[PDB]
Amino acid sequence: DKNELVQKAKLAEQAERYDDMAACMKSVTEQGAELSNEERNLLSVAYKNVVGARRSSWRVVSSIEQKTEGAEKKQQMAREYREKIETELRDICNDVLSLLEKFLIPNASQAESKVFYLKMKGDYYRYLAEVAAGDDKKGIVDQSQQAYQEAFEISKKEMQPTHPIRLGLALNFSVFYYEILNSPEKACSLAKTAFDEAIAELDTLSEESYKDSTLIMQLLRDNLTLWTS
Amino acid sequence: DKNELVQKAKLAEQAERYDDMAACMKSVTEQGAELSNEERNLLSVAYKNVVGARRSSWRVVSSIEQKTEGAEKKQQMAREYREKIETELRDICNDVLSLLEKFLIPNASQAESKVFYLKMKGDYYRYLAEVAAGDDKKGIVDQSQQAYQEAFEISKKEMQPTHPIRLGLALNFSVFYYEILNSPEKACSLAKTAFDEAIAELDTLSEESYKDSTLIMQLLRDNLTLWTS
Amino acid sequence: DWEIPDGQITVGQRIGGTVYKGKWHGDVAVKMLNVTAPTPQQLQAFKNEVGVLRKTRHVNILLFMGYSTKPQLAIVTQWCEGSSLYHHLHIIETKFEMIKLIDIARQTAQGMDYLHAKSIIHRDLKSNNIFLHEDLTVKIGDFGLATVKSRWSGSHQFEQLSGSILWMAPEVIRMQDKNPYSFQSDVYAFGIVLYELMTGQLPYSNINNRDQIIFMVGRGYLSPDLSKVRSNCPKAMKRLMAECLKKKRDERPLFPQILASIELLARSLPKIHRSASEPSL
Amino acid sequence: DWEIPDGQITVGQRIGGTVYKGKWHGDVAVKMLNVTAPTPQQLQAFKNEVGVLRKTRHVNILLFMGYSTKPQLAIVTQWCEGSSLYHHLHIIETKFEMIKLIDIARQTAQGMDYLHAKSIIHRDLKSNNIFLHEDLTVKIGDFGLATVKSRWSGSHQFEQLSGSILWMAPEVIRMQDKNPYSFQSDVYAFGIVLYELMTGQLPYSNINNRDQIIFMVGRGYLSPDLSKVRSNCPKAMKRLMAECLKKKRDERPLFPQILASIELLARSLPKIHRSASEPSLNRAG
DSSP, rough: OOOHHHHHHHHHTTTTHHHHHHHHHHHHHOSSOOOHHHHHHHHHHHHHHHHHHHHHHHHHHHHHHHHHHOOOHHHHHHHHHHHHHHHHHHHHHHHHHIIIIIIEEEEEOOOOHHHHHHHHHHHHHHHHHOOOOOOHHHHHHHHHHHHHHHHHHHHHHSSTTTTTHHHHHHHHHHIIIIIIIIOOOHHHHHHHHHHHHTTTGGGGTTTHHHHHHHHHHHHHHHHHHHHTO | HHHHHHHHHHHHHHOOOHHHHHHHHHHHHHHSSSOOOOOOOOHHHHHHHHHHHHHHHHHHHHHHHHTTOEEEHHHHHHHHHHHHHHHHHHHHHHHHHHHHHIIITTTSHHHHHHHHHHHHHHHHHHHHHHHHHHHHHHHEEEEHHHHHHHHHHHHHSSSOOOOOHHHHHHHHHIIIIISOOHHHHHHHHHHHHHHHHHEEEHHOOOOTTTTHHHHHHHHHHHHHHHHTT | OOOOTTTOOOOOBBBBOEEEEEEEESSEEEEEEEOOOHHHHHHHHHHHHHHTTTOOTTTTTTOEEEESSSOOEEEEEEEOOSSHHHHHHSSSOOOOOHHHHHHHHHHHHHHHHHHHHHHHHSOOOOOEEEEEETEEEEEEOOOOOOOOOOOOSOOOOOOOOOOOOGOHHHHHHHSSSSSSOOHHHHHHHHHHHHHHHSSSSSSSSEEEEOHHHHHHHHHHHHOOOOSOOOSSOOOOOHHHHHHHOOSSSSGSOOOOOOHHHHHHHTTTTOOOSSSSSSSOO | BOOOOOOSSOOBOOOOOEHHHHHHHSSEEEOOOOOOOOOHHHHHHHHHHHHHTTTTTOTBOOOOEEEESSOOOOOOOOOOOOOHHHHHHSSSOOOOOHHHHHHHHHHHHHHHHHHHHEEOOOOSSSSEEEEETTTEEEEOOOOOOOOEESSSSSSOOOOOOOEEEEEEEHHHHTTSSSSSOOHHHHHHHHHHHHHHHHHOSSSSSSSOHHHHHHHHHHHHHHOOOGSSOOTTOOHHHHHHHHHOOOOOOSSSHHHHHHHHHHHHTTOOOOOOOOOOSSSSOOOOO
């Protein structure tokens, strides 16, 4: 019952149980019908929290693995755990990504929905990239670039420069440039122009998303200052 | 290899992965040999963190269950999740408690070790009590009382009043009185006398456990002030 | 003298007269006018606002640093890192502990006590003019409506009522006297601040008619619903809030009595953690 | 006016004229004299010190709050929680990260830049008159020797040299001019502060003869051993320290050039930080 599955999802969220939360919204999405946008947001929160817990564990242990340059035994132990954490992290990304390919992107009927799910697809391939090594990696990076790019094209054409979603896409796509493709200048100019373009049209801000747009603009500018360091 | 299992355990701990941490020390304890006391502490940290995550989830959802006084549907949903969380929480407590009955309490050779593991047994039965309803509950409460009491008897006879472990036992045993047996006056006088007795013998503090003793004395006095509210 | 020779100030971003983040011996806040031709009324406004700030040196008054005339009329003050109390309470809904909330009350009172002690009535105290600097120190700002009590009652002249309605005392709204402002009107505003602090919400949330609120508050029909205070709010605070909010201005306490109360409110109060039990070493 | 009517101030503990922790609209610091009969020289001292403080409003100058005359001459300022830079560096040996040390340098420079910009020479800058307020903000205090530059070389007259020797510039020690103080003498003191910051120790630790240090520094024989800077000290800082410490005062940089160089030292420095990854919009709530 999509409305039960959704009500439990918010219960899961208040209890800080994001894997339960993510399981509810997963099965909602699987009912094959277009997600509402309170629904869409519930799915995005769940999986961002579920995947983010693994990303953060990965980074801690990956770091231990590098600070133990043999120390072979500690380094072997760290490597093994890293790879165990990776495989949780890949299952999570593949889960999301198959939801995107199978239901959410095909059912997206409005432009804002397509930019949102294509960004998300850019995001989950980027999390797979953070963690890919070798043969896998170029393919994975290409897919992330391609989703962001498509999203970026639609959002430039359809949305106001201060729209939270267009701003967030520019934020994440610029992060992809800097962090995954090691191209800081491209990252800086993508973020600079998204910032300047939103300053040029502050009249387009609305009461109900004012807050998010404003926060993302600040995050754009903070990365820039970090990247120019 | 007890020393491998222990080295991974500290790795688990730094990565904030307390279920892995708890799994290492479990299998250490199972090697049947007396735990060292760096070991003992690693086991206690792991399971305190593993069980505490469930206790805290239990409290959130138990609360939702009471604030949804029908609201039958929400209350049914909350009840179900509560009970799912309970059963994780009981498995964890039983796991610990069978380690205590089977290895740690029988192998405890020094007085300080017995007070530590008997307190721990008081603790895990108390966590089961927090969560028991009806038939189970008196038995469970009796066992908690009995472990604390035995511990309390040994610690009064063998340890200095400022010993962290004796102070902690008084702290937890007083919490058991107030919270599980709803006897605040008994709880207050147990905590007051443990505090006053440690003030009387500040010369017994030593360089290396000064800090813990001092913190527990402060916690004794904070509960008292809360309980006298 | 506090005139900053032209050229030294380096205006940057904007925030909300109008306020910019600038540069003059470090980060500063710049509040210059955007009117190329300053009317003699905007001029006396400036002269007056500077006049008041000049008399303030206290850790809970936002630090006046100097003024400029040349490029545009402007007031320079310390820069603040961190948000307004408004922002914490109604935007990012910061989950302050009750001891912190009491402390914010206390500091805000401290700054107000200091102003009144030098005869300054702020006249625009709210949750947006109270900054939690570095999240630790309350700095009261925006002295654009501030004024000094004149010993004579024939120098009040006339002034068009301005200000945010949610913090305006009934007597101010009614605007029946030559001068309806008093130390007590500032207290009332602080009363509404207690309300935001102890409840988490602005007053009159069910009413969205601006003119209706002005009319019903001025008339006595409408007043804050004190039942909306959160349950952890010390009884002494609820009482103190209701006292600051009294309709009959003379029935309101002044800031020493406010600091005398809040001074003992947190003095004989119990900030504990209940759960305690036994935390891992 | 900043005269605090008698009775309002409530003097308490002591710390180190003489300084007490008191009460006046919150915790304050009270520096009143213990001389029942203030000589007209102690009087002009007071008048002058108040005169200087009155002109300061900046987050890195310790906040003057007002003065009292009645009971005993006294200066009231903000209270500080937390220790002096002296105390951190040589007493509790706080293990600051190099980015923090640079930042302390930067703020100290910021406060000095502000004073010099209004023509105040502090004349007693050291590691004991620099407070890390709440461990986060440098407040420069003790303006007991502070003075304002007179346009006319007919006011210096005669003042008996006083101050801590480890921070006194050679020209000040020598005391050959009518007025050997300058913005540059303050810079030199700040130079010694850089020394404490980049090395962890006071200068001349092998010498314990007070008069010898005065004599050898004034003469040019003695100067800080820059080799004692810790290895994590950015080369730009070592250079900047050696420049502030130049014996020929005119060769020393002033505070804008010091604040302009320090701003760049932290610009291209080795620091960690960096984050902001798809900061979970979370347009829920």
